[PDB]
Amino acid sequence: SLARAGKVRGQTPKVAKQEKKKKKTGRAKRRMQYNRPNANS
Amino acid sequence: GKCRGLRTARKLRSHRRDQKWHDKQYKKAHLGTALKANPFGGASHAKGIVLEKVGVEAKQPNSAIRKCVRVQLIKNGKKITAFVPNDGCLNFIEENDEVLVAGFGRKGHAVGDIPGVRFKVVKVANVSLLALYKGKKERPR
Amino acid sequence: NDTVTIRTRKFMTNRLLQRKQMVIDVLHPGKATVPKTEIREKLAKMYKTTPDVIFVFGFRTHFGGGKTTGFGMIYDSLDYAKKNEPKHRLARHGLYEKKKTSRKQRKERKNRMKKVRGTAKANVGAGKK
Amino acid sequence: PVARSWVCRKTYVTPRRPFEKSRLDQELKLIGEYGLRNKREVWRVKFTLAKIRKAARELLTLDEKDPRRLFEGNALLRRLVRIGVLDEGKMKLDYILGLKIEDFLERRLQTQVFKLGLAKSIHHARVLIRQRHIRVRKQVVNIPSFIVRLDSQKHIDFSLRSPYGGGRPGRVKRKNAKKGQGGAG
RNA sequence: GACCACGGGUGACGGGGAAUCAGGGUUCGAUUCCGGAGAGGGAGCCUGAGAAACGGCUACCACAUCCAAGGAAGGCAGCAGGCGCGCAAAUUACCCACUCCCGACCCGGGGAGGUAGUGACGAAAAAUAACAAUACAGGACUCUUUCGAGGCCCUGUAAUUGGAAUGAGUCCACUUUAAAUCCUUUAACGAGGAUCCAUUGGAGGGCAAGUCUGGUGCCAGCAGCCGCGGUAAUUCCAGCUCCAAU
């Protein structure tokens, strides 16, 4: 009954955090997004 | 129809005060009975002791077994049911551990598929349960 | 250096205290705040007086540097300056020395001497030894 | 009993309807035009514009012949003229409500510096200002949001101490010169 | 005394006043301001102009300090600090220099006050990167609208370097300060992935984002409302990318 807690969390593989270049912060990010969205098709 | 005369203001204040005892929000707060009746006693949080670990069935449309904890509050000794918010934190928490209990929402009403359950669990053994879930901290040894 | 110049404002002579209150402005293009010793020397040089009865304090520098504003007193006599001056300001240039005892110790000795009566000196000797 | 202020106030009001797509685009376009850091500065400058707009509304609703109306009215025109969001030839009480938030953004030090040509870009102006290279009235101003009075409009120039105006080398120039001298020797 | 007495409750000291806003208004008021009350409780009192006073005393009630057992000596809802209730609040610091106050009186005292230590608790002002020509994808234009070429500004590329600029922190000095630190300057340092790595929650709506890829398969969970879960889940757990505030 209470033994199935967190079953899915432990079952899925623990994919390591991939290396992503740091994104601009503050003023530079605001200017960048103005110059330029998640078209997954 | 409603009175409009210029020398009836006392009637206006009386009719508004004796009809203010007719709405579920005003009368609930200004009778002093709701605050004496909730196990919190007007508390946004509370330090209680984990007594029992139980599994409660979800509502009719959902077939789920939530992980609630029966906790007795140190302030007045009320036995309440408090579901553990995040996944995997039921195994993170253990019995005989002091925890901090917070709200579910809806101003003291049951939220989601957990019937009769209004309480959430955080600050397990003086470390945040969100911290334990994210791995920021660990239980003291 | 011929770059740092001293100006004054709000000049008024107070013969009641035998001094001359001023507001000292220092203009330096690319240097930091000049030491107070140099401020006293230069101001006394242009006032044709000695840099001994002159006291300066309270120098604040404007944002970005350059301009500093402060207070200056030019006492007529050294004896009058000693009579009319806060003791800490006198100790800045070395004219008075304050007691080295701590306020905590003075309170402790005051309490002990308040407990006794007739001979307050008796507890003073034992406490200091 | 303490000797301090206990006095402050809020400068910006969060919009009642946040995440509105229309206002998000307008604020983003304003940010991309004047080089704003974020939306808070918009919330602030629009608030100051809103406040003197409300003062105009209350001033309008006042009676026709009021010395206090003329005193507060003309005084508000003198300020708006000397900051420069309103023309001097449009001296009228009703014209106050016609002001625009973008017009207020035109009067910033960063925008005025970019318009005068001291910097190649608006963000270049903000970088230089944050780095203390622009001075007005022989005083370095490091606030991009600092408001320049229309009277002191022609008194913006590079500082006499900065490497741009004065020409004194900095950390990078000294290190490069010393490395070259060492290699040559 | 029905124009609401008498009574009770209050998670009530009052008010000058605080949040919010078409307007009318709804709530909160100990707080640092002006008055009242209290110094565990309510009793009492001598001096003093002014006390029914608690950093005065007496007695009683709980608590409890020392005792040589014959007594003595008590009230931190004062400043720190401690214990107990608690989701919920600071250093057993320095000084009378600023503010004023007390005293025979300029010279002494003030946990009143000022300063420092903690302080994402609130209110601001604010760094975390700007440019160049290269190659491509290109955008805005000019001749022609024919294969289309050429010329000025702008966007993107852990692709190319560069020039000058800059603080965050080392840091001799100066300055402020009763004596000290930061803040305001100045010497020498200090950026290339400038790694000197901004974060909290989502990707159905309200309110801005994914019919992206996996694991799981109405179980875990998510989910404020509907609802999302029987194998190819846009809502579950992971990776990438976008959305908001910073």
UniProtKB/Swiss-Prot annotation, chain B:
Record has rRNA-binding as a keyword: no
Cross-referenced PROSITE patterns, in alphabetical order?
A: RIBOSOMAL_S12 (PS00055)
Record PTM N6-acetyllysine, positions in chain = 134
Q: SUPFAM superfamilies of this UniProt entry?
A: Nucleic acid-binding proteins
Positions carrying 3-hydroxyproline are: 61
* Ranges in a coiled coil: none
Q: Post-translation: what modifications? A: Hydroxylation at Pro-61 affects translation termination efficiency.
The disulfides recorded in the entry are none
Q: Where in the cell is it found?
A: Cytoplasm, Cytosol; Cytoplasm; Rough endoplasmic reticulum; Nucleus, Nucleolus
Q: Give positions of region: Disordered.
A: 1-25
Locate residues linked as Glycyl lysine isopeptide (Lys-Gly) (interchain with G-Cter in SUMO2): 36
Q: What GO biological process terms are annotated to this protein in UniProt?
A: cytoplasmic translation; maintenance of translational fidelity; ribosomal small subunit biogenesis; stress granule assembly; translation
The keyword RNA-binding is assigned to this record: no
Q: Which residues carry this modification: N6-succinyllysine?
A: 53
Keywords linked to the UniProt accession? Acetylation, Cytoplasm, Endoplasmic reticulum, Hydroxylation, Isopeptide bond, Nucleus, Ribonucleoprotein, Ribosomal protein, Ubl conjugation
Q: Which GO terms describe its molecular function?
A: structural constituent of ribosome
Mark out the compositionally biased spans (Basic residues): 1-19
- An annotated GO cellular component: cytosolic small ribosomal subunit
**Summary of subunit composition and partner proteins:** Component of the 40S small ribosomal subunit. Part of the small subunit (SSU) processome, composed of more than 70 proteins and the RNA chaperone small nucleolar RNA (snoRNA) U3.
Function, in words: Component of the ribosome, a large ribonucleoprotein complex responsible for the synthesis of proteins in the cell. The small ribosomal subunit (SSU) binds messenger RNAs (mRNAs) and translates the encoded message by selecting cognate aminoacyl-transfer RNA (tRNA) molecules. The large subunit (LSU) contains the ribosomal catalytic site termed the peptidyl transferase center (PTC), which catalyzes the formation of peptide bonds, thereby polymerizing the amino acids delivered by tRNAs into a polypeptide chain.
Q: Which family does it belong to?
A: Belongs to the universal ribosomal protein uS12 family.
Q: What is the protein named?
A: Small ribosomal subunit protein uS12
Protein source organism: Mus musculus (Mouse)
Please name the gene that encodes this protein.
Rps23
From Swiss-Prot, chain C:
Q: What binding partners and quaternary form does the record give? A: Component of the small ribosomal subunit. Part of the small subunit (SSU) processome, composed of more than 70 proteins and the RNA chaperone small nucleolar RNA (snoRNA) U3.
Function statement: Component of the small ribosomal subunit. The ribosome is a large ribonucleoprotein complex responsible for the synthesis of proteins in the cell. Required for processing of pre-rRNA and maturation of 40S ribosomal subunits. Part of the small subunit (SSU) processome, first precursor of the small eukaryotic ribosomal subunit.
Which positions does the record annotate as the modified residue Phosphothreonine?
A: 8
Q: What protein am I looking at?
A: Small ribosomal subunit protein eS24
UniProt feature, compositional bias: Basic residues: 100-118
What are the record's GO terms for cellular component?
A: cytoplasm; cytosol; cytosolic small ribosomal subunit; nucleolus; postsynapse; presynapse; ribosome; small ribosomal subunit
Please list where the region (Disordered) is annotated: 91-129
Q: What is its main location?
A: cytoplasm
Family, per entry:
Belongs to the eukaryotic ribosomal protein eS24 family.
From Swiss-Prot, chain D:
For biological process, the GO terms are: cytoplasmic translation; positive regulation of cell population proliferation; ribosomal small subunit biogenesis
Q: Where is this region: Disordered?
A: 161-185
Primary localisation category: cytoplasm
GO MF annotation list:
5.8S rRNA binding; structural constituent of ribosome; translation regulator activity
Pfam (any one): Ribosomal_S4
**Keyword terms, alphabetized:** Acetylation, Cytoplasm, Isopeptide bond, Nucleus, Phosphoprotein, Ribonucleoprotein, Ribosomal protein, RNA-binding, rRNA-binding, Ubl conjugation
Q: Which residues carry this modification: N6-acetyllysine?
A: 65, 115, 154
Concerning InterPro entries, the annotation shows: Ribosomal_uS4, Ribosomal_uS4_CS, Ribosomal_uS4_euk/arc, Ribosomal_uS4_N, S4_RNA-bd, S4_RNA-bd_sf
Q: What positions are modified (Phosphoserine)?
A: 152, 162
Transmembrane region(s): none
At what sequence positions does the UniProt record place the cross-link Glycyl lysine isopeptide (Lys-Gly) (interchain with G-Cter in SUMO2)? 92, 138
Q: How does it assemble?
A: Component of the small ribosomal subunit. Identified in a IGF2BP1-dependent mRNP granule complex containing untranslated mRNAs. Part of the small subunit (SSU) processome, composed of more than 70 proteins and the RNA chaperone small nucleolar RNA (snoRNA) U3.
NCBIfam families recorded for this chain? PRK04051.1, uS4_arch
* Function, in words: Component of the small ribosomal subunit. The ribosome is a large ribonucleoprotein complex responsible for the synthesis of proteins in the cell. Part of the small subunit (SSU) processome, first precursor of the small eukaryotic ribosomal subunit. During the assembly of the SSU processome in the nucleolus, many ribosome biogenesis factors, an RNA chaperone and ribosomal proteins associate with the nascent pre-rRNA and work in concert to generate RNA folding, modifications, rearrangements and cleavage as well as targeted degradation of pre-ribosomal RNA by the RNA exosome.
Q: Which family does it belong to?
A: Belongs to the universal ribosomal protein uS4 family.
> What is the protein name for this chain?
Small ribosomal subunit protein uS4
- What is the gene called? Rps9
